[PDB]
Amino acid sequence: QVQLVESGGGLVQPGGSLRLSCAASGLTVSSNYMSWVRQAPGKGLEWVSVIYSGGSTYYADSVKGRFTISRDDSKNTLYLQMNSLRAEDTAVYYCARDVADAFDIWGQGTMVTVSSASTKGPSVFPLAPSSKGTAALGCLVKDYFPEPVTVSWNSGALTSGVHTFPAVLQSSGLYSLSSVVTVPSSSLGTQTYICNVNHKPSNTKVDKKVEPKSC
Amino acid sequence: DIVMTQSPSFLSASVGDRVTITCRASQGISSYLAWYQQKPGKAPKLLIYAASTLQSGVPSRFSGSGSGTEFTLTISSLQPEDFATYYCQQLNSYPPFTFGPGTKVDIKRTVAAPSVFIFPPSDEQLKSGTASVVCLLNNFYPREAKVQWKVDNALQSGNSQESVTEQDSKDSTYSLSSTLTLSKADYEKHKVYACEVTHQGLRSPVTKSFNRGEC
Amino acid sequence: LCPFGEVFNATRFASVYAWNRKRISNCVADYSVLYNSASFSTFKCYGVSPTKLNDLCFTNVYADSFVIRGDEVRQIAPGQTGKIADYNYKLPDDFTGCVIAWNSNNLDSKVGGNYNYLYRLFRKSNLKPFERDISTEIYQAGSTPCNGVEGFNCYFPLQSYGFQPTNGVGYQPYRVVVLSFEL
Ligand SMILES: *[C@@H]1O[C@H](CO)[C@@H](O[C@@H]2O[C@H](CO)[C@@H](O)[C@H](O)[C@H]2NC(C)=O)[C@H](O)[C@H]1NC(C)=O
User: According to the UniProt record, where is the region Immunodominant HLA epitope recognized by the CD8+ (chain C)?
Assistant: First the structure.
């Protein structure tokens, strides 16, 4: 087949370095216009760098001086060496081949996270159903790093009505997300509701029972 | 520098509809335009290049048109697998590889007003130094919704974050959570916490509130 | 008198990949009149002074001419890189001469697009200085031979500018004359 396989993404501190690799199959890296294109969380596409068959290299103004593109013809592999990384460089990085500037072949992407935060498990707080016929309850999964966190309800038995929201990055550098579920208000007295939170990077597993605030 | 714009930023359509997305160039660029389709978490897919040339393997219902400053991507009969974000790209541009900002096409359905819930901070979180107040907007359509936080009727700006789900597979609605974060000391300085929601399905804005320290 | 009229004011210019070279010798030229003309948007001299041009004596004079985009004129200079400098027309680092260019939108653009002007998009290696490649072999961008058939990873090496008068200036055609002196 024809494909571009990327690797090397991971966690880096601001100022740090990281080298991505893109192993090609079905095209010859050294005889093509090969590029890196990135996409920050929730944003559009940003071209980063290109290398020509003849060796010329170019960079987006936002990375010039910090990034260097290169290739190994013997391994048919494209590289991006990223130095003095910054939080705004956090993004999914794609390698791609262009023909007359149209990118027809793309890699699958490798995620790069630049943060000064340290690995930290979440605190899980109840979002308790109101005391005042559908009721909403949930779990607030707060102050964790890095992504991802997984949330289930009643160990997977409760799926209908569940909304687990995308994580948000707080000013502190830590992530927070909410998971909510709507249920019949008549079931608040009879059915137990437990949200199961798993944060593999910290090996944290939390089960939080969510009940109406007592009175 | 030539600026690429795309109109509309958001489009709602149904299967079978005819869809036209426009891409604009601040100066004439002849037929130097490509179009891409991207689905969440996937690499973009080349649809069109040279403004009107269909990429091989792309269904015939995709077509491109235009030359100069005004370009159009048309999907003759929308199919379920076409709900996605679409990007134009200026070819041979200076600086290189300028992308348009994208047009997201989502599934049209009838207007559905949100169910609104407000959650006070848990006692456990308050033990630590901060209070998270959460407002939930559940199962609404269209995506456009405004959440205004009020604290003793002072409108709050700069201390809240939002996140939104992708539109649900069964009922094509959205859900949105907004979180207001305060220090414990600031939280205890006020009584009435309110979430005011504006939406097309609501005749007038709906307010959900609680009084701090009350069952 | 030296025949600059038939280089600068020629009706048609060459494509940059097939750039034209005119040898100028055994004639008298007023180089100062060229510099004094207001028609040129680019008049950049390397290793010489434009004002003191007329005083000088040259072994050999070459006038190369072609058409490129406005945004590519900056590549016609020593030490530059890009699709033009790399794969179409390359000046040496030690160039002594002058690069003259002017906008030719009124002459070389056409409603509906003028596709007579081409440039080489694909080449395995960079050109040597003053090298001229006019092959039209199918470019093999992968490991499978093309055998003269365009297809996936098998590309015609030349592309057309397709100049239209409504183009932004960076996409408009520019006529270029390169005067190189053995001196
Ligand atoms: C190319 O043709 C143009 C237009 O005829 C020439 O421009 C004029 O040339 C006359 C001399 O015949 C001068 O008196 C004018 O002042 C020129 N006008 C401008 C605006 O330059 C131009 O000189 C010709 N170039 C060559 C090399 O022969």
Answer: 114-122
